[PDB]
Every structure is written in C-alpha cells, then in structure tokens.
Amino acid sequence: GGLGRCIYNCMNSGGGLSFIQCKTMCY
C-alpha cells in the first residue's frame, strides 16, 4: 500500500519533515 510505510519511514525514521505531511499526504 503506502500510508502503512509512508508515515513509517516518514515519521519513524526516514522523512525529515512532519507527520501530518505524511500521515495524510501519502496517497
């Protein structure tokens, strides 16, 4: 899928941005 890993790498450790910028941005 995407959201599953999106926030994972984005938030867990692999984004360098924010949460709302990935928890929702990711399609």
- Using what technique was this structure determined? NMR
Three-state DSSP state, 24: coil
Find, among 9, 5, 8, 6, the residue nearest to 25 by Cα.
6
Burial of 11 (C-beta count, 10 Å sphere; 0-12/13-18/19+):
middle
Annotated domain spans of the chain:
1-27
Three-state DSSP state, 3: helix
Find, among 4, 27, 26, the residue nearest to 12 by Cα.
4
Give the ranges where 1-27 is alpha helix by DSSP (H): 3-7
Counted residue by residue, the chain has a size of: 27
CA distance linking residue 8 with residue 23, whole number of Å: 9
